[PDB]
């Protein structure tokens, strides 16, 4: 609603929120399904799946890539608020790479230590907090899944 | 209060000089009952102390010419200030029922000196059945105690006063024993 | 427990005091710490 | 003894968690204690110092023997042997069994207490099994419920410091100038504070556990983050060309350090041990591959 | 695949057209993959016993 009413003013800020709403909606579609018939067992899993799986978004992806955004901002006006280095992140971590020696830059470390530590630490953390998920899901299954599914029904 | 903690019940049988002469002579206050109003051992009285121990003769002597049965144990107006962390209902009948005293509760319900209303409420609003509900727990050992006392009290209430529905008695939060459980 | 001990030690710039638990409740001719226990299965 | 031990110390050392010899150990311990009381009641057998300044209780705590440790911690007796006890029941009310425990195992005004020995000087795998016994457990709960406010205050201070660091270091040119100067001053002061605090922590805790590697790597990470912070900040003063990357390393490291304050505050603590364990496999990982 | 076509796009609003792809899409995909792994793990540790031999005999 806010994005649509802001689009009436013909402001550049309407586009983000709008599309954000869209993606959020396709998350909300998971509620109607997955708990309708003989499928709440698959819903409950570890902690309603999503409630325990959100530890990757708001811990190591959003607030963490905020740091690398600040980095590529300060790893040289286009540099204004956040728009300068978001595309740099988006084309560096899973894109191409172009950074040579320039006037007082020392590319050694930006692409040899920063890009070579980001992916490493992310993989290491996701592996162990996958080990976590299996360790918690070997137990808890018990039989309480039927009871909690009946409760939400 | 301090003369009951002893054993053998060899003192209460001879407290008659304390009972007469002192009583009915310029004592508009509680006769010997008192209330023991303080923080430690908050409230309480002779009846509660007698019910505390597995003794019936002292209870008989106390109720023959003593305090009323509808006397709150913790009393006061602050529920967060109590003499002991055990909640039983703040009533002699509730204390007797919660402690599995069949003979004591049997004598308390019917005695031609001071009948005890089975529907008497509590300062918080609870009653005997509510008190049995709150002190209950999921352990199998006390579950049998609670269930058997509940059944016995319900049967006795039906036999004595069948004109009142004990189950449909509302709490101060508008709850019944079933809803509270 | 490790964290509790560490904060109990205090900051570097200021030296925090201590707060002993329990009081001198004598049980005979002795600092003590009281606890209320409820165990239905213990007694039968 | 030549090593400094005595009869009770020897009974402690040869003890084991197996139940076959546990009955032997506790029975002989109680018997010797009672006979020592009967013959010479003017001596404190329990309060006899080792050559490392330890007592039978502290020695049992340090060596990892639990069954004898629990029995010593909860010793009741009855009859003429009342004073040789550490757990006194006041009054019994069915399940209500209010009791009093003795505290010779409290850190407050007692240097080298049992709690410190369990936390720091103990190497046994049972060290987490010895913090659930009733007196220690209730004491730890009562002590932790008092200092949650300081923990959350430190959390908030760290959060605002990191927000200031992010904002200030973000707008690097590569009255805004005054704002950036003040921000850099704040960042250098915070880095100096963190360095000094961590240095005091390591100086005080010199003996470690074994080498202080598997249990205190978060302090090492904090020291490293603040060290790179101050290094890059002071190197930028000379306008030397190395400052720019390393600085944000500090920044990114800081966002890892924030995981320490969280993850262990309330009904959330069981996340950390797995992350401690995942670093163990790196022993050959780096070597065998590549 | 997520590679190659991720460079500077001309005249796009860069505040909400790029903070949703790596921020949410990969999150959802790996979450679903790990959920399926957990399901396989569940029908792996349990409901296995020794009935695989019997099912092999049934196929034979």
């Amino acid at each position: 609603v806010l994005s649509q009413v802001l689009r009436f003013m013909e402001t550049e800020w309407y586009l983000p929120l709008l599309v954000l709403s869209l993606v959020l909606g396709w998350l909300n579609l998971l509620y109607y399904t997955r708990g309708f018939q003989h499928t709440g067992i698959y819903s409950v899993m570890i902690q309603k799946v999503i409630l325990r799986d959100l530890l990757r978004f708001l811990l190591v992806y959003l607030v963490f890539l905020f740091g690398f955004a600040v980095a590529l901002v300060s790893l040289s006006a286009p540099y204004r608020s956040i728009l300068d280095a978001s595309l740099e992140l988006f084309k560096f971590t899973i894109g191409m790479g172009e950074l040579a020696f320039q006037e007082q830059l020392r590319f050694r470390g930006v692409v040899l230590l920063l890009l070579l530590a980001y992916v490493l630490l992310t993989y290491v953390l996701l592996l162990n907090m996958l080990i976590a998920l299996m360790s918690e899901t070997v137990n808890h299954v018990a039989d309480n899944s039927w009871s909690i599914w009946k409760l939400q029904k | 209060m301090k003369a009951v903690l002893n054993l053998q019940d060899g003192v209460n049988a001879c407290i008659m000089p304390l009972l007469q002469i002192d009583k009915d002579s310029g004592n508009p206050k509680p006769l010997v009952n008192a209330q023991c109003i303080d923080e430690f051992y908050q409230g309480h009285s002779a009846l509660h102390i007698a019910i505390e121990k597995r003794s019936l003769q002292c209870v008989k002597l106390l109720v023959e010419n003593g305090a009323d049965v509808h006397l709150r144990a913790c009393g006061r107006f602050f529920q967060k200030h109590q003499g002991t962390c055990f909640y039983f209902g703040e009533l002699p009948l509730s204390l007797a029922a919660c402690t599995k005293q069949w003979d004591v509760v049997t004598y308390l319900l019917e005695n031609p000196h001071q009948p005890a209303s089975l529907e008497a409420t509590d300062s918080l609003g609870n009653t005997v059945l509510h008190a049995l509900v709150m002190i209950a727990d999921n352990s199998p050992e006390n579950s049998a105690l609670v269930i058997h006392m509940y059944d016995g009290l319900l049967q006795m209430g039906a036999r004595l006063c069948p004109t009142v529905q004990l189950e449909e008695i509302s709490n101060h939060q508008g709850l019944t024993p079933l809803k509270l459980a | 427990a490790i964290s509790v001990l560490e904060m109990e030690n205090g900051y570097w710039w200021c030296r925090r005091k201590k707060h002993r638990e329990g009081r001198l409740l004598k049980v005979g001719t002795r600092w003590c710490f009281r606890v209320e226990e409820v165990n239905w299965a213990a007694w039968e | 003894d030549s090593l400094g031990n005595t009869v009770l110390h020897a009974l402690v050392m040869i003890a084991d968690n197996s139940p076959e010899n546990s009955a032997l150990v506790i029975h002989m311990y109680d018997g010797l204690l009672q006979m020592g009381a009967r013959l010479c009641p003017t001596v404190q057998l329990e309060e006899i110092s080792n050559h490392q300044g330890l007592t039978p209780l502290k020695l049992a705590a340090k060596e990892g023997k639990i069954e004898i440790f629990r029995h010593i911690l909860q010793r009741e007796f009855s009859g003429p042997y009342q004073p040789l006890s550490r757990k006194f029941t006041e009054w019994c009310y069915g399940p209500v069994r209010v009791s009093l425990y003795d505290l010779s195992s409290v850190d407050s005004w007692e240097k080298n207490s049992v709690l410190e020995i369990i936390a720091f000087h103990c190497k046994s795998p049972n060290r987490h099994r010895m913090v659930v016994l009733e007196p220690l457990n209730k004491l730890l709960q009562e002590k932790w419920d008092r200092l949650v406010s300081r923990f959350f205050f430190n959390f908030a201070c760290y959060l605002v410091y990191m927000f200031i660091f992010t904002v200030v270091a973000y707008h690097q040119p590569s009255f805004g100038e005054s704002m950036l100067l003040l921000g850099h001053i704040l960042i250098l002061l915070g880095g100096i504070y963190l360095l000094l605090g961590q240095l005091w922590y390591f100086w005080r805790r010199r003996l470690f556990i074994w080498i202080s590697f598997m249990d205190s790597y978060f302090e090492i990470l904090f020291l490293l983050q603040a060290l790179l912070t101050v290094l890059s900040q002071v190197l930028r003063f000379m306008e030397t060309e190395w400052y720019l990357p390393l600085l944000v390393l500090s920044l990114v490291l800081g966002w890892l350090n924030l995981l320490y304050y969280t993850r262990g505050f309330q009904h959330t603590g069981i996340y950390s041990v797995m992350i401690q364990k995942v670093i163990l496999r790196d022993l050959l990982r780096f070597l065998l591959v590549y």
Side-chain angles (χ1 to χ4, degrees), chain A, chain B residues 1-7 10-80 82-167 169-181, chain C residues 1-43, chain D residues 1-46 48-110 112-290:
Chain A
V1 175
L2 199 150
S3 170
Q4 188 274 330
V5 73
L6 190 147
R7 190 226 43 76
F8 182 43
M9 321 285 178
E10 297 100 15
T11 310
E12 210 183 2
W13 270 23
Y14 82 91
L15 182 61
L17 279 74
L18 193 75
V19 62
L20 294 174
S21 295
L22 180 63
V23 56
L24 202 53
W26 292 98
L27 303 179
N28 282 350
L29 199 84
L30 203 48
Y31 155 62
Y32 279 80
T33 75
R34 176 81 149 290
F36 74 102
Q37 195 173 1
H38 62 57
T39 186
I41 298 92
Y42 324 120
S43 68
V44 292
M45 294 297 102
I46 61 171
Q47 173 194 10
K48 282 183 201 142
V49 176
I50 189 166
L51 286 175
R52 179 71 275 171
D53 288 327
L54 61 84
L55 202 56
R56 272 90 69 192
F57 167 69
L58 191 60
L59 193 45
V60 301
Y61 268 124
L62 182 62
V63 70
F64 189 72
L65 277 296
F66 194 20
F68 284 101
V70 181
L72 281 183
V73 165
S74 160
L75 288 174
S76 302
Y79 299 138
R80 191 265 185 191
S81 47
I82 45 179
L83 304 196
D84 62 358
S86 63
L87 282 72
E88 287 187 350
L89 294 174
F90 174 80
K91 194 37 149 57
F92 278 165
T93 179
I94 48 164
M96 301 265 158
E98 193 273 332
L99 188 64
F101 206 53
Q102 278 71 244
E103 201 271 335
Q104 286 186 357
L105 187 56
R106 294 298 155 86
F107 74 97
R108 314 204 76 240
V110 176
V111 299
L112 187 135
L113 189 59
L114 290 204
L115 292 177
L116 294 181
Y118 172 24
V119 181
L120 183 63
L121 62 83
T122 50
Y123 268 115
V124 175
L125 62 83
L126 62 83
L127 294 174
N128 190 77
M129 89 166 169
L130 187 164
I131 304 304
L133 282 71
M134 66 181 180
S135 70
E136 319 315 299
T137 196
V138 303
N139 11 65
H140 187 47
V141 265
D143 205 69
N144 309 336
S145 308
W146 203 78
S147 72
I148 178 153
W149 172 52
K150 202 69 66 176
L151 174 55
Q152 41 186 169
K153 291 175 76 71
Chain B
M1 300 201 194
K2 262 73 79 176
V4 173
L5 279 74
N6 50 6
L7 275 297
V11 61
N12 270 296
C14 66
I15 65 182
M16 72 291 291
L18 283 72
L19 296 175
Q20 293 82 17
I21 304 300
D22 291 331
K23 88 185 176 56
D24 201 72
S25 295
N27 46 3
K29 75 211 181 316
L31 188 153
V32 286
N33 317 318
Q35 197 40 248
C36 186
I37 304 169
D38 44 2
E39 172 52 43
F40 180 75
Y41 272 9
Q42 165 56 254
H44 277 73
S45 176
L47 286 171
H48 303 71
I49 297 169
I51 301 174
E52 280 274 19
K53 271 68 66 178
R54 303 286 183 89
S55 176
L56 185 141
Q57 316 88 353
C58 63
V59 176
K60 288 204 163 153
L61 177 48
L62 262 61
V63 303
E64 277 291 327
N65 49 2
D68 53 350
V69 176
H70 317 104
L71 184 62
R72 322 273 177 83
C74 292
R76 211 178 176 88
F77 44 87
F78 204 48
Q79 193 46 252
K80 304 182 184 61
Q82 62 181 356
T84 312
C85 296
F86 174 59
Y87 173 68
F88 58 88
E90 307 174 9
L91 270 185
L93 175 53
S94 301
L95 183 63
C98 291
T99 53
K100 194 168 50 49
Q101 306 282 155
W102 268 127
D103 62 358
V104 183
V105 66
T106 313
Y107 182 79
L108 275 153
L109 268 294
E110 68 282 0
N111 54 89
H113 294 89
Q114 190 67 27
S117 295
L118 191 42
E119 55 184 346
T121 183
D122 174 38
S123 71
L124 195 148
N126 295 7
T127 190
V128 193
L129 311 156
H130 289 103
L132 272 296
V133 163
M134 309 219 78
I135 75 164
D137 196 81
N138 295 303
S139 56
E141 321 186 350
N142 62 359
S143 298
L145 173 147
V146 173
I147 195 181
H148 199 274
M149 294 299 291
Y150 199 102
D151 300 318
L153 292 173
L154 201 49
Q155 295 170 351
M156 280 205 227
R159 167 154 60 264
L160 265 74
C161 312
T163 181
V164 289
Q165 293 224 40
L166 295 182
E167 288 288 329
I169 287 290
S170 60
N171 209 348
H172 274 169
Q173 322 175 37
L175 295 200
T176 64
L178 175 64
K179 290 179 190 178
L180 179 62
Chain C
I2 297 174
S3 65
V4 164
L5 274 296
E6 271 295 357
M7 331 195 288
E8 211 275 349
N9 208 353
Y11 290 133
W12 62 270
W13 61 272
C14 83
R15 294 331 201 181
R16 186 178 182 271
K17 294 162 200 94
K18 314 273 220 183
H19 167 214
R20 185 204 59 138
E21 293 82 3
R23 57 218 170 285
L24 270 77
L25 188 153
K26 279 313 283 150
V27 290
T29 314
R30 183 91 77 91
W31 306 351
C32 298
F33 182 89
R34 68 152 68 253
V35 66
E36 271 86 40
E37 306 161 354
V38 171
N39 197 358
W40 281 101
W43 75 298
Chain D
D1 167 36
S2 73
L3 195 148
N5 291 9
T6 191
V7 192
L8 309 155
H9 291 105
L11 267 298
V12 165
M13 308 215 67
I14 79 162
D16 196 82
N17 304 330
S18 56
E20 293 83 3
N21 62 2
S22 168
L24 162 55
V25 170
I26 296 89
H27 182 26
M28 292 286 329
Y29 199 105
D30 298 318
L32 292 171
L33 203 49
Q34 296 169 351
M35 311 205 58
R38 169 155 63 264
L39 281 72
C40 312
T42 182
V43 290
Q44 297 293 321
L45 296 179
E46 288 285 327
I48 286 289
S49 179
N50 209 349
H51 273 170
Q52 319 176 35
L54 299 201
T55 64
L57 178 63
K58 292 175 191 178
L59 174 65
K62 182 172 199 309
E63 297 296 329
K65 318 292 170 43
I66 174 173
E67 304 292 339
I68 176 68
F69 175 68
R70 167 174 45 195
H71 163 75
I72 301 177
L73 213 57
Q74 311 158 354
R75 203 173 68 234
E76 52 275 27
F77 290 167
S78 61
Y81 305 137
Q82 171 90 357
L84 302 187
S85 186
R86 294 177 70 90
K87 158 187 176 173
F88 299 100
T89 64
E90 197 177 7
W91 46 260
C92 176
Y93 186 93
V96 190
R97 269 190 54 86
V98 54
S99 56
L100 271 69
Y101 288 76
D102 196 345
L103 294 177
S104 295
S105 86
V106 60
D107 63 358
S108 199
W109 292 271
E110 301 216 0
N112 196 7
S113 64
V114 176
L115 280 170
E116 307 184 17
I117 288 181
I118 297 178
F120 298 152
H121 305 289
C122 180
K123 294 169 213 313
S124 65
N126 264 326
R127 51 190 296 175
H128 66 87
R129 293 250 316 284
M130 282 145 78
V131 287
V132 307
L133 315 179
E134 293 179 357
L136 298 197
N137 172 35
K138 310 319 289 303
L139 190 44
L140 283 179
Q141 189 92 2
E142 194 273 343
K143 199 172 289 185
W144 156 258
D145 276 357
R146 171 176 329 148
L147 281 180
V148 177
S149 81
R150 194 81 80 191
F151 192 68
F152 279 153
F153 168 73
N154 189 359
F155 188 22
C157 280
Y158 190 68
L159 183 63
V160 308
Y161 173 98
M162 294 299 291
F163 182 76
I164 297 315
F165 187 40
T166 287
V167 171
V168 164
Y170 182 100
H171 292 291
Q172 206 71 11
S174 70
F175 287 153
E177 62 273 15
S178 53
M179 182 179 72
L180 268 70
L181 190 60
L182 267 296
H184 288 101
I185 297 169
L186 294 174
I187 299 308
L188 68 92
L189 294 174
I192 291 169
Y193 187 92
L194 262 71
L195 292 204
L196 188 153
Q198 292 308 293
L199 278 189
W200 174 65
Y201 164 82
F202 292 102
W203 154 262
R204 202 183 65 250
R205 195 219 203 260
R206 65 179 87 262
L207 319 169
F208 321 125
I209 296 177
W210 59 274
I211 321 172
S212 72
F213 179 74
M214 294 182 286
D215 220 327
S216 66
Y217 64 91
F218 263 105
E219 281 96 309
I220 300 153
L221 261 53
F222 267 74
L223 183 46
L224 206 79
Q225 183 266 359
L227 179 61
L228 282 71
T229 300
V230 65
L231 190 145
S232 171
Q233 200 51 69
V234 71
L235 188 145
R236 194 228 46 78
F237 176 44
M238 187 66 204
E239 303 101 14
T240 312
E241 185 196 355
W242 289 352
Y243 76 92
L244 183 63
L246 258 63
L247 190 75
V248 74
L249 280 163
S250 296
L251 192 162
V252 60
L253 203 51
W255 290 118
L256 295 174
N257 284 196
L258 188 83
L259 199 41
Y260 181 76
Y261 280 78
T262 77
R263 224 174 59 190
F265 73 100
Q266 196 170 1
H267 71 275
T268 179
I270 50 182
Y271 298 147
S272 194
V273 60
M274 64 184 73
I275 296 170
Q276 294 179 356
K277 298 320 199 153
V278 66
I279 322 291
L280 186 58
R281 53 95 187 188
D282 291 347
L283 74 164
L284 62 86
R285 179 67 178 87
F286 188 74
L287 181 43
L288 261 53
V289 74
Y290 292 164

